[PDB]
C-alpha cells in the first residue's frame, strides 16, 4: 500500500522507530513484450529415419546428419508406442522450444 | 532519558533476537516437503525419507553454525569492551590517569564505579575551568641584565604590573627570586621585557 | 541468487531468514563504519578557525594548514595522500549510461552492480573530514591542550612549545635560547615528510590493502556465480529451458545452497575485517585524544 | 529468446566484433551479455534493466506517518519512477511530484524538502545529507539538510596574549561499557531432531559437528565469567565503609549502598537495574510456568522446548554490588593507596 | 566471445619451447609420422605443394582411413578403406 506498511512488513512489527531502520526493497524493472527470434527454415526429413523399411546393422550403425531444418518433434509422438523414450540431458516436452 | 543505557540494552536485544530467529529456522523447508520430521516419517518410506531428513539436517546445521559464528564474533567485541573496562577500572578508579579523554572529558580527578546488568557505569569527576580572562604575557624578565624564567608558573600582566601565576588558575603573585630562575643574558630571548624582581 | 528468475525466489523463501540475517549483518557494519569515523574526527564540538597566518615563532605550518588555492580546502600533504590511495568505488552516483557500452575497460563495478553488489557512500564526506582535521589542527596550534579539556585558551606557540619541553624534563630556557634552531629543524622535518610520501608510493600500503581486500572480496563473489555446484549448468534460465520443473528443482536447489554458502562466507569475512577496522579505529581514536589533544608520557 | 536463451535485458546494438563461428558472449560471471541475432548478422548486447535499492526514511511512528523515499544510486533526472500501472511490482506505491525530489550523491531522495539551514544529523542518509522531522515549516514535515559539524569558533591568537581561567566547574560524566553477555547452550539432537527415533542416527554420521559447537558455546560461557571477574574482582579485600560522617562536605549517599532496600545497592544502581530489562536471567523457571497461559509473550518456553536455554551468570547481582561497594569504600577512605 | 579478461582452459595444446621436427622432403621413402593425440602442422611454402593429409591406424584396406585432399577449387574428405602405398602422392 505505502512505504510505511512495506517497512512494517519488513520489520515484522506494527511500530517503526525513527530512521530507515532497514532496507525496504530493491527496484526491478519488468518486461513489457517478448522477442522470440529463432531462425528461418523448412521442415525436417524425419520420415527418412522413422518411415524406413529396413535399418542398418548394429556394428554398421548409420549416422544421419541433421542441419538447416525446423525440427518439429511433435510428428514423432503420433507413431507407434515406443518401448523407452528417455532423454538424459533434457525433457521430452522441451525439445520443441530449444535450438541445436 | 531512558535511552542512556542503549549500549547495554542492545546487548540483551541482540542475544534475544539471535535466539528468536534460530527458533523460526525450524519452520523452514530446506527443499523438503515439510518442516516436521514426524510428518515426513509418516508420509514417505524410510528409503525416501532419508533424502528429505538429510535436507533438514544440513539446513539446521547451517543455522546452528551461523549462530555460533556470530556469537564468537560478539564474544570478541564484549571481551574487547571488558578488557577496556578492566583497564579503565584500574586507571580511573584505582588511581589518577593523565591520559586525555580516557577517564572522561577534562582533567580527571577521580572516578566512581557503578554496577549495571551486563555492564558497568563510571562516574568520571573531571576538572573543567570556566570564565577565563585575557592577559599580556612575556617569555622572561630582564632586571639585572639577566633573563628570569618562571619556575612553575607563567608571567602575566594586568596592563601596568607584571605577576606570576599558575596555568590552570589565576593566582597572581609578585615576581621574586624564589619563583623564578636565571639562565643566560637578555639578548637570546625574543619577547623578553624589562621588569623589576623582588629579593 | 536468482537474477530476475520467476521460478527462482520461490524455493529461496523456504530456507527461512537467511536473507534477512545477512542483510542485518551488512547494515550493522555500515552503521559501524560511520561510528568509527565519527569517534575519531568529531571528538571536538567547536570548529576552530585558524587566524591569519602570522609569525608563529618561526614555525611554518603551510604544509599542514588548509590551502584555499585548491578546492576541497585541504593541505598539500592531504592532497598527496588523497592521490596515493585509489578508490575502486567511492559509492557515489553512477549514470546508467556509464555501463552501457565501452565495457572493454576494467569496469568491474558494473558487473557486480548487475548482480546486487553495490557500495554505499560514507556518511562524512572528505570535505567534512578535512574540516574536522583543520579544526583539530587550528586548535592545538593556538590553544595547545586547553581546548581538549575545556574552553580554548589562546597562548603563543613559542610559550606553548616551551611547556612541551617542560613535560619531558627540559627546562624552558633551552627552547627560548634555541628558538631559531628548533624552528629550522621543524620546518626541515616537515619538508622531508612530503618528499618521502611522494617518492615512496609504498608508504600508504595499509590503507591500500583495505580497499584492495574489499574489491577482491567482491570480485571473487561474482566469479562464484559461474560455478556449477553439482548442477548441469551455472545459468538458471538454461536449466528451466532444458529440464522439467520437477527435475529442475533439484538442480536449482544445488545452485541456491552453493550461492548461499558463498554469501555467508563473504559476510563472515566482512564481520572479521570489521572487528579489525574497529580495533584500529578505537586505537586511532585513543591516539587522537592522547597525542593531538594533549601530551602523552607513554 | 534467440536460440533458447531466455532472460531479461535491453538491447543496445553495440560495436563488438564477433567472429563467424562466435554467436554468444559471456562476462566474468559467465552471464551472456552479448548475442548475435539469428536472422540479421548484427550484434546486440544484453544489459539488465533498471535496478537499484530503495530505502524509506521513517520518523517515529508515535509522531507521524509521513515517510520519505530514497533511491540509492539513482539519478532524479533520468527515471524517478516512470511507470503507469503495468510496470514493476516490488513496491505498489508511487510518489510522482510535489517539490520533494532532491539529487544527492548517494541517490535520489523523494519526500523531503531541502533547506539551506544546517542542523545536527538526526537520520543519516549519506554524502553528508541527513533528514529530520521538523515542525518549523506552521506545519510539520520531513526536511533534508546538510549536517552541522559544530558551532563556528575563532581563537584570538596573539604573540603576546594568553588566557588564564579564574574559576572552575566540577563536572561528572557517565560512561557505560558492556562487560558480559548472556551465556546460552544449545542441545544438538533436541534442536535438529526433536525426540525423533529415526533421526539422530544420520546426524552421528556427520562427525563431531555437535561437539565442536558445544565446546564453542561453553568456551564463551567460561569467558563471560572471566570478563566480569577481571573487572570487579581486581581487589582482594572487601573494604567496608565506616559510619557516614562529614566527608569534607561531599555527599556520597547516592553512590554508597543503602541498607533500606534489599540487594544492598545504591539508588543509582537501583535506577540502572530498572532501565535494562533482561529477557531471560537464566534462573530456575517452574515447569508449570510454560503449561497454560501461553497467550503472553513467553518466547523463553518456545526456545527451551527446542534445546535453547540460557545459563545464569556465576557472580550474581548482589556479589557485583559488594565488589562495587568495596571499590567505592576504598577510594573514598584511602585514595589510590589500596590499589598499589 | 571474451574481451579484456583472463580465462583458464585445460585442453590439448602445444607446449611452449617444445622441440618440433622440421622436414625438408627432399627425399622420398619417409614413413608415416605417429598421431600422438593431435598434431601441429605448419609450413611456409607458396607453390601449393602440401595440399592434403591422410589419417588412419594401419593405412591399409584392413582398417578405416581418413583421406583429406585440398584442390584449387574444392576439398574432398572421405572415410573409406583406402589401400595406401608406401609413398602416397598426388599426380
Amino acid at each position: 500500500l505505502d512505504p510505511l506498511s512495506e517497512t512494517k512488513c519488513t520489520l515484522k512489527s506494527f511500530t517503526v522507530e525513527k530512521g530507515i531502520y532497514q532496507t525496504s526493497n530493491f527496484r526491478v524493472q519488468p518486461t513489457e513484450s517478448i522477442v522470440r527470434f529463432p531462425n528461418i527454415t523448412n521442415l525436417c526429413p524425419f520420415h527418412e529415419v522413422f518411415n524406413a523399411t529396413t535399418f542398418a546393422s548394429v556394428y554398421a550403425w548409420n549416422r544421419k546428419r541433421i542441419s538447416n531444418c525446423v525440427a518439429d518433434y511433435s510428428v514423432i509422438y503420433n507413431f507407434a508406442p515406443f518401448f523407452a523414450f528417455k532423454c538424459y540431458g533434457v525433457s521430452p516436452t522441451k525439445l520443441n522450444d530449444l535450438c541445436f | 532519558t531512558p535511552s542512556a543505557l542503549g549500549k547495554l540494552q542492545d546487548v540483551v536485544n541482540h542475544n534475544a533476537q539471535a535466539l528468536n530467529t534460530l527458533v523460526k529456522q525450524l519452520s523452514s523447508k530446506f527443499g523438503a516437503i515439510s518442516s516436521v520430521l514426524n510428518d515426513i516419517l509418516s508420509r514417505l518410506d524410510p528409503p525416501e525419507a532419508e533424502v528429505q531428513i538429510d535436507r533438514l539436517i544440513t539446513g539446521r546445521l547451517q543455522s546452528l553454525q551461523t549462530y555460533v559464528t556470530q556469537q564468537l564474533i560478539r564474544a570478541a567485541e564484549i571481551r574487547a569492551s571488558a578488557n577496556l573496562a578492566a583497564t579503565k577500572m584500574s586507571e580511573c578508579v584505582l588511581g589518577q590517569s593523565k591520559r586525555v579523554d580516557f577517564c572522561g572529558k577534562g582533567y580527571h580527578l577521580m572516578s566512581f564505579p557503578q554496577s549495571a546488568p551486563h555492564g558497568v557505569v563510571f562516574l568520571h569527576v573531571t576538572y573543567v575551568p570556566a570564565q577565563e580572562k585575557n592577559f599580556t604575557t612575556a617569555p622572561a624578565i630582564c632586571h639585572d641584565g639577566k633573563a628570569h624564567f618562571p619556575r612553575e608558573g607563567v608571567f602575566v600582566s594586568n596592563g601596568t604590573h607584571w605577576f606570576v601565576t599558575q596555568r590552570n588558575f589565576y593566582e597572581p603573585q609578585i615576581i621574586t627570586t624564589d619563583n623564578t630562575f636565571v639562565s643566560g643574558n637578555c639578548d637570546v630571548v625574543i619577547g623578553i621585557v624589562n621588569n623589576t624582581v623582588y629579593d | 541468487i536468482c537474477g530476475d528468475s520467476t521460478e527462482c525466489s520461490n524455493l529461496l523463501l523456504q530456507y527461512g531468514s537467511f536473507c534477512t540475517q545477512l542483510k542485518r549483518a551488512l547494515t550493522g557494519i555500515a552503521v559501524e563504519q560511520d561510528k568509527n569515523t565519527q569517534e575519531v574526527f568529531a571528538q571536538v564540538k567547536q570548529i576552530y578557525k585558524t587566524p591569519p597566518i602570522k609569525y608563529f615563532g618561526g614555525f611554518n605550518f603551510s604544509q599542514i594548514l588548509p590551502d584555499p588555492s585548491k578546492p576541497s580546502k585541504r593541505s598539500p600533504i592531504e592532497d598527496l595522500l588523497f592521490n596515493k590511495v585509489t578508490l575502486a568505488d567511492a559509492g557515489f552516483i553512477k549514470q546508467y549510461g556509464d555501463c552501457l557500452g565501452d565495457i572493454a575497460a576494467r569496469d568491474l563495478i558494473c558487473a557486480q552492480k548487475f548482480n546486487g553488489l553495490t557500495v554505499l557512500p560514507p556518511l562524512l564526506t572528505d570535505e567534512m573530514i578535512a574540516q574536522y582535521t583543520s579544526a583539530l589542527l587550528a586548535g592545538t596550534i593556538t590553544s595547545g591542550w586547553t581546548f581538549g579539556a575545556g574552553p580554548a585558551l589562546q597562548i603563543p606557540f613559542p610559550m606553548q612549545m616551551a611547556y612541551r619541553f617542560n613535560g619531558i624534563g627540559v627546562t624552558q630556557n633551552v627552547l627560548y635560547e634555541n628558538q631559531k634552531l628548533i624552528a629550522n629543524q621543524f620546518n626541515s622535518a616537515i619538508g622531508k615528510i612530503q618528499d618521502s610520501l611522494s617518492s615512496t608510493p609504498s608508504a600508504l600500503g595499509k590503507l591500500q590493502d583495505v580497499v584492495n581486500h574489499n574489491a577482491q572480496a567482491l570480485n571473487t563473489l561474482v566469479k562464484q556465480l559461474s560455478s556449477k555446484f553439482g548442477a548441469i549448468s551455472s545459468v538458471l534460465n538454461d536449466i528451466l529451458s532444458r529440464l522439467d520443473p520437477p527435475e529442475a528443482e533439484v538442480q536449482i536447489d544445488r545452485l541456491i545452497t552453493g550461492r548461499l554458502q558463498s554469501l555467508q562466507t563473504y559476510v563472515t569475512q566482512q564481520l572479521i575485517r570489521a572487528a579489525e577496522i574497529r580495533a584500529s579505529a578505537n586505537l586511532a581514536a585513543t591516539k587522537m585524544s592522547e597525542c593531538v589533544l594533549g601530551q602523552s608520557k607513554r | 529468446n534467440f536460440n533458447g536463451l531466455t532472460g531479461t535485458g535491453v538491447l543496445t546494438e553495440s560495436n563488438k566484433k564477433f567472429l563467424p563461428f562466435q554467436q554468444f558472449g559471456r562476462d566474468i560471471a559467465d552471464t551472456t551479455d552479448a548475442v548475435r541475432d539469428p536472422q540479421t548478422l548484427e550484434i546486440l548486447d544484453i544489459t539488465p534493466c533498471s535496478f537499484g535499492g530503495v530505502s524509506v526514511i521513517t520518523p517515529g511512528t508515535n509522531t507521524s506517518n509521513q515517510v520519505a523515499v530514497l533511491y540509492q544510486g539513482v539519478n532524479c533526472t533520468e527515471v524517478p519512477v516512470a511507470i503507469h500501472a503495468d510496470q514493476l511490482t516490488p513496491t505498489w506505491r508511487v510518489y510522482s511530484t510535489g517539490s520533494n525530489v532532491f539529487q544527492t550523491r548517494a541517490g535520489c531522495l523523494i519526500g523531503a524538502e531541502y533547506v539551506n539551514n544546517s542542523y545536527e544529523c538526526d537520520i543519516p542518509i549519506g554524502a553528508g545529507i541527513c533528514a529530520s522531522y521538523q515542525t518549523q515549516t506552521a506545519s510539520q514535515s520531513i526536511i533534508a539538510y546538510t549536517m552541522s559539524l559544530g558551532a563556528e569558533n575563532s581563537v584570538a591568537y596573539s604573540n603576546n596574549s594568553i588566557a588564564i581561567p579564574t574559576n572552575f566547574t566540577i563536572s561528572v560524566t557517565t560512561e557505560i561499557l558492556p562487560v558480559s553477555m548472556t551465556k546460552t547452550s544449545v542441545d544438538c539432537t533436541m534442536y535438529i531432531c526433536g525426540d525423533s527415533t529415526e533421526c539422530s542416527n544420520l546426524l552421528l554420521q556427520y562427525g563431531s559437528f555437535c561437539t565442536q559447537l558445544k565446546r564453542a558455546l561453553t568456551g564463551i560461557a567460561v569467558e563471560q565469567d572471566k570478563n566480569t571477574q577481571e573487572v570487579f574482582a581486581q581487589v582482594k579485600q572487601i573494604y567496608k565503609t565506616p559510619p557516614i560522617k562529614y566527608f569534607g562536605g561531599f555527599n556520597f549517599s547516592q553512590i554508597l549502598p543503602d541498607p533500606s532496600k534489599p540487594s544492598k545497592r545504591s539508588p543509582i544502581e537501583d535506577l540502572l537495574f530498572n532501565k535494562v530489562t533482561l529477557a531471560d536471567a537464566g534462573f530456575i523457571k517452574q515447569y508449570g510456568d510454560c503449561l497454560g497461559d501461553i497467550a503472553a509473550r513467553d518466547l523463553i518456553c518456545a526456545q527451551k522446548f527446542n534445546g535453547l536455554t540460557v545459563l545464569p551468570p556465576l557472580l550474581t547481582d548482589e556479589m557485583i554490588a559488594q565488589y562495587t561497594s568495596a571499590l567505592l569504600a576504598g577510594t573514598i577512605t584511602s585514595g589510590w593507596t589500596f590499589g598499589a | 566471445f571474451r574481451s579484456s579478461v583472463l580465462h583458464s582452459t585445460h585442453d590439448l595444446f602445444l607446449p611452449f619451447f617444445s622441440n618440433v621436427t622440421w622436414f625438408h622432403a627432399k627425399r622420398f621413402d619417409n614413413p608415416a609420422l605417429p598421431f600422438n593425440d593431435g598434431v601441429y602442422f605448419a609450413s611456409t611454402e607458396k607453390s601449393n605443394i602440401i595440399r592434403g593429409w591422410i589419417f588412419g591406424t594401419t593405412l591399409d584396406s584392413k582398417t578405416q582411413s581418413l583421406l583429406i585432399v585440398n584442390n584449387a577449387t574444392n576439398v574432398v574428405i572421405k572415410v573409406c578403406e583406402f589401400q595406401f602405398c608406401n609413398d602416397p602422392f598426388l599426380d
Side-chain angles (χ1 to χ4, degrees), chain C residues 225-240 242-243 251-252 254-255 259, chain D residues 5 26 30:
Chain C
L225 297 178
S226 61
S227 304
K228 302 171 57 180
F229 303 93
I232 61 178
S233 180
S234 60
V235 181
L236 282 74
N237 298 329
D238 298 0
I239 302 180
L240 297 175
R242 289 168 54 179
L243 300 181
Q251 308 295 336
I252 294 180
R254 294 183 178 180
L255 295 182
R259 295 178 181 181
Chain D
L5 181 62
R26 299 182 298 182
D30 290 1

Side-chain angles (χ1 to χ4, degrees), chain C residues 15-31:
Chain C
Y15 286 86
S17 301
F18 287 160
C19 293
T20 310
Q21 290 180 182
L22 298 182
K23 182 177 300 300
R24 297 196 307 263
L26 296 178
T27 57
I29 302 179
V31 301

Side-chain angles (χ1 to χ4, degrees), chain C residues 155-175:
Chain C
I155 173 180
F157 193 86
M159 298 193 59
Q160 171 193 161
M161 200 63 176
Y163 285 94
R164 301 292 189 174
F165 283 71
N166 185 87
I168 63 179
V170 183
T171 59
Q172 301 180 1
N173 59 268
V174 180
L175 177 136

Side-chain angles (χ1 to χ4, degrees), chain C residues 104-105, chain E residues 3-4:
Chain E
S3 60
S4 300

Side-chain angles (χ1 to χ4, degrees), chain A residues 13-92:
Chain A
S13 60
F14 288 81
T15 60
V16 182
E17 299 181 0
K18 180 181 57 180
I20 17 85
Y21 213 176
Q22 240 293 339
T23 300
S24 181
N25 202 330
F26 293 83
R27 176 188 75 264
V28 172
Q29 184 182 192
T31 63
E32 59 181 0
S33 300
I34 31 83
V35 176
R36 261 88 283 262
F37 239 79
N39 3 284
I40 15 157
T41 11
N42 60 289
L43 257 299
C44 226
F46 284 160
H47 55 73
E48 299 181 1
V49 52
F50 292 98
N51 289 326
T53 60
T54 305
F55 282 3
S57 298
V58 195
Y59 76 102
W61 54 276
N62 179 85
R63 172 168 293 186
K64 209 283 181 300
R65 182 180 182 271
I66 292 181
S67 60
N68 301 90
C69 85
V70 275
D72 187 8
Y73 300 91
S74 300
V75 306
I76 313 179
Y77 299 149
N78 52 263
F79 278 90
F82 310 105
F83 197 15
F85 199 172
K86 178 182 301 179
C87 302
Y88 296 90
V90 283
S91 301

Side-chain angles (χ1 to χ4, degrees), chain B:
Chain B
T1 301
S3 179
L5 290 82
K7 296 183 179 181
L8 260 46
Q9 184 65 24
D10 292 0
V11 174
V12 301
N13 287 17
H14 291 179
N15 292 127
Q17 182 180 180
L19 292 179
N20 293 331
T21 188
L22 191 61
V23 180
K24 297 185 300 181
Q25 293 293 338
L26 298 179
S27 61
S28 305
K29 301 171 57 181
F30 303 94
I33 62 178
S34 181
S35 60
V36 181
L37 282 75
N38 299 330
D39 298 0
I40 302 181
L41 294 174
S42 300
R43 290 169 56 179
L44 298 182
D45 48 320
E48 187 68 22
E50 292 181 1
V51 182
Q52 309 295 336
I53 294 181
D54 181 72
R55 295 183 178 181
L56 295 182
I57 295 181
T58 57
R60 296 179 182 182
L61 277 173
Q62 187 178 8
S63 300
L64 289 179
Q65 293 183 359
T66 304
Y67 170 79
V68 175
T69 302
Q70 295 182 358
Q71 289 293 147
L72 290 172
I73 298 177
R74 289 187 176 94
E77 302 180 1
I78 297 300
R79 185 187 66 259
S81 300
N83 296 330
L84 178 61
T87 303
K88 189 161 300 180
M89 177 68 67
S90 59
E91 295 184 1
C92 309
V93 178
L94 304 183
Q96 185 178 7
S97 180
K98 301 300 181 60
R99 302 171 62 179
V100 184
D101 296 1
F102 186 81
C103 308
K105 180 180 181 300
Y107 300 97
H108 168 245
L109 297 176
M110 63 191 308
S111 300
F112 305 102
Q114 298 300 325
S115 65
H118 295 355
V120 65
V121 179
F122 294 95
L123 301 181
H124 301 285
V125 177
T126 60
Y127 179 88
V128 179
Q131 58 181 210
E132 69 283 350
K133 296 180 59 181
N134 302 331
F135 302 96
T136 301
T137 179
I141 298 299
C142 190
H143 175 54
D144 299 328
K146 298 177 300 180
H148 298 68
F149 307 93
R151 184 180 303 271
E152 75 286 339
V154 55
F155 296 150
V156 296
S157 179
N158 65 331
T160 54
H161 298 164
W162 291 90
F163 302 95
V164 48
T165 178
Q166 48 184 349
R167 295 176 52 87
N168 301 330
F169 192 85
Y170 179 75
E171 186 180 0
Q173 296 181 359
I174 55 180
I175 301 180
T176 56
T177 60
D178 56 356
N179 301 332
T180 57
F181 60 95
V182 47
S183 297
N185 301 330
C186 307
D187 53 355
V188 293
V189 192
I190 301 300
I192 181 174
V193 301
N194 300 330
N195 186 87
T196 176
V197 179
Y198 179 80
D199 189 9

